[PDB]
Each structure stands twice: as C-alpha cells, then as structure tokens.
Amino acid sequence: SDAPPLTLEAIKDRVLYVLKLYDKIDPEKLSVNSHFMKDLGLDSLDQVEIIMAMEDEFGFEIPDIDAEKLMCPQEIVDYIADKKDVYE
Amino acid sequence: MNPIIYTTLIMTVMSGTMLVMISSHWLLIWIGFEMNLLAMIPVLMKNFNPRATEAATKYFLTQATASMMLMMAIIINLLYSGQWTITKMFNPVAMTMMTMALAMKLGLSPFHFWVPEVTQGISLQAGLLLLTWQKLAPLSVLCQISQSINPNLMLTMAMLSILIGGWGGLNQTQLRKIMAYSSIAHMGWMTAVLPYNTTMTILNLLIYITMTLAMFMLLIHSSATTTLSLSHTWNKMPVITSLMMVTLLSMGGLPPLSGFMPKWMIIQEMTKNESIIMPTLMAMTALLNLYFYMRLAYSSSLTMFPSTNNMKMKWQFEHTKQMKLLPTMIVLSTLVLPMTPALSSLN
C-alpha cells in the first residue's frame, strides 16, 4: 500500500524536528507559535533556507509567494495541512 | 504495418506450426518452433502502444527459454542414443526437460504467469491467434512423445493449471485476462488425458478452439475489452449479448451444450484406467470457471446495466466488416453434443 494517512501531529513533529535541526536556532527555545523573525531574530534569508528545508522534508514545491507568510511553525503546519488536505 | 507484410508474417507463423507438425527429425521441429516465434513477435506488436512492447518482450523471453531447454533435451536424447527421430525419448532426464519446455511453451502451471500479461497487453486479434493457433505445435509434439511421458509430472501440472486458471479468473474484470485464465484451465484439461488417450486430447483441443474463436469474434464484434464496456452492448446489439451468454454457458461445461462433451469424454476415459480421484477433483474445480463465466453473463445479458447518451448516435450505424465464420463457430460451439460418436473419426 501507499503512504499512511498522515495527520496534523505528524506534520508538527516533522516541522519541529526540522527547526531543531537548524544551527541558527537554539532547540529548547523555539515554540510552535514563535515568530521566526521576532522571537529568534532571524533575517529574511534565513527564512528562505527554512522553507527550502520544508520542501526537502515534505517533498512539494512551495512557491516564493505563500512562503513569504509562513513566519512561525504553526503557519507552516497549516500550509502543509491545506496543501495535503489533512483535517484531523 | 503493410498488409502484404502482415500476410507473409501470418503465413510464416502457420508455416512454422506446420513444419513442427510434419517433421520426423527433432531438429526440424526445433526449427519450426523458432520460425513460429520469429514471425509471432511482430504480430503481437502490430499496434505499437508500449503495453504491446512489454507483452512481446515477455513472450519472447519465455519462448526463447523454452526453446533452449527443448534443444538441450534433444541433445541429451541424442547423446544417450544416436537418434534424431521423434519417438519415445530414450532418456528420462531428457524426457523431463522436454516436458518442462513444452509446458513452458503452452503456459501450463506453474509456467502459466506469462499468459494473462501477454494476452492483456496485445490486441484482440492477436489474442485470438495467441490462444488458438499457438497451442497446436506443442500439443502435436506431446501427442507423439506421450508414451514416454511421466504421468506424475504431467498430471501434477494439469491439476495445477486447472486450479490456477479457476482461481485466477475469479479476480478479473478485464476480458482478455479472463480469456487467458480460461485458456490455462482448458490446457490443464487437455494435458490430463494425454497419457491415456490422445484422441481425447485432440477432441478437447478442437472444441476449445471453436469456443475460443466464437468468444473472441463476439468480443471483436462488440469492441469491448472490459466488463463495464461489455455491459453497454445490450443497448446496442442485444443478439450479440444473447449469443455471448449461450457461448459462456457452453464454455462452463453445462449439458446439453458442446462444452460438456470434452469433460464428459475425459472423465470416462480416466475411469477406464482406474483414475477416480483425479477426474472428480478436476470436475469439481471447473466450477470456478463456471462461476466467473456466470458473473460475466450476469453483467452483459441477464441484466441491463445503465448506458450513456452518446450511445444513441451509435444506433444509426451498422457493423461494416462481417466475420463470415462467426455463425458457424457459434453453432459448433453450442449445438454439437448429439454428434459425439463422430469423435471416432479423430483416431
């Protein structure tokens, strides 16, 4: 059979694993609702690298638009849920 | 492909089969098989459509492997006796190799895997030729060497073919795979009686060929290769579906239809040789074939499936090219049981 029925909890776990895998972010400091620019003091270029890491993690192309707004982990989870049609 | 090229390839296929059928030298029989395969490959690829390329490659690999084992058996037999004539096969290892090569060529279980794939991947005309003409040469060879054939191996493959054809047909919605599994089961029936009586093998082959020709021509007439596509035919040509239902019932082996004659004639023969368990298992297993024929009959003729609006346009046109031998084939595949004793003319 094909891939399992991915859920929101899996998306959040993978996204937070990716963020804690980033060197410029101290792991235990980041939260699900922490704004990338304000909370972690991350510049615009840093956000681009994180979005590309998401594209590698979940295997789908996130355009330049719709990536300019994913500014905290929760928005990333919502975007992936919308793109993959996951509700529960 | 050019029509002249198609005609000459068909003549080469038939010429290879006849070369196998008239030869007394093993090398000429091998050459006939090679010549048959060489011209057979382009007929399977007549419409390009990469599934046909896949089917042709699988068929070529299977038949080339079988040809190599056949040649090796011929050479072993020659080594143990300086004989080239097709006879009772003086060596038993050579006999086992020859039986396995011929079982691969016919598609008997467990060498049966290629038949459903190749049949599904080619067109209906190619499937007709593959499931009717291609069986003549290997069975004609097996009839000749039947006396030296080991019953335990041949009957094991026959029972396996009947079981596997019956089980495989149950899961199929595509008509060509259904035909392939039906072919595997009927091959098993043919080869079960071969060590006892080759006239029964010939009779079963002839009845199976007429039934298969009728079924394939009825599927060509109504351009249907799936169950749902065939379920539209009642709303365009009801007569075709009625004749298809009767032919399916005959293929099932139900009396008083033509399909019943071979099984009836094989079971009886096996009872004269003190074989009771084997015919009982074969007859009970053939009910799987009957089941998946009955399911198709339910889909196409005994109930009416929903149709489409554009079918209305098809009501205004007639089938242009007619198959002249279809009526004779239908009558021969259904109403021939009262002339069973004429089978004595086959020996």
């Binding site: - | 090398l27 091998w30 050459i31 090679e34 395969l37 060489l38 490959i41 690829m45 990469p50 599934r51 390329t53 896949e54 089917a55 042709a56 490659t57 699988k58 070529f60 690999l61 080339a64 492997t65 040809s67 190599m68 084992m69 040649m71 090796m72 050479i75 020659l78 080594l79 300086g82 080239w84 895997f113 459903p116 794939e117 190749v118 599904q120 991947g121 495989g168």
Partner: protein, 98 residues
C-alpha cells in the same frame, strides 16, 4: 560420460540459471541466452564428432543460424523498451499484471 561432457552440461546449467535469475539490465539476460546457445553448439559438436555421424556435421551450423535470429530479435526488442524508458531495466516492464 567423460569430464568434458559434464563441464559442457554444467556450462549450460549455469547459463540457464543466469538467465532465470534477473538482475537489472535486459542485455545481461540476452548474454545468458547467447551463452546457452554456445553451450548447446559445443555439446552437439562433441557428440557428433565422437560418433562420426557425417551428415549431422551440418546441424550445429544450422543451430548457429537460428541463434542469430533469436539474438537479433532480442536486441530489436531491447531497442523499443529503451526508447520508451531511456533504460533497459526489466523493472519498467510492469504495466501488465497477473
């Protein structure tokens, strides 16, 4: 049977085994088909020479001829498959199931 006959028969068995156990490349299997033909040629030539069957001396040559027709056939198919996939891997021949 002398040791040479068993060596030739073992060569045929190894080639048949090689043909049966597929790896990835289609051409690797066509080579095993060619090897089976070569083993048959050597075996039949040895048997024919040993028993001094003069007429049979033409049959290995015939055996060679239909070896080419089978190889040329196979290579032809290998072209079409490659033209569909850009690769001769047998994994790609999975459009039709059982």
């Amino acid at each position: 049977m002398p040791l040479v006959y068993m060596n030739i028969i073992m060569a045929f068995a190894i080639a048949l085994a090689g043909l049966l156990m597929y790896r990835s490349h289609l051409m690797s299997s066509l080579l095993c088909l060619e090897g089976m033909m070569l083993s048959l040629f050597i075996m039949s030539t040895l048997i024919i020479l040993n028993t001094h069957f003069t007429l049979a001396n033409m049959m290995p040559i015939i055996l060679l001829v239909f070896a080419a027709c089978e190889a040329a056939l196979g290579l032809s198919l290998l072209v079409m498959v490659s033209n569909t996939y850009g690769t001769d891997y047998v994994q790609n021949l999975n459009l039709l199931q059982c």
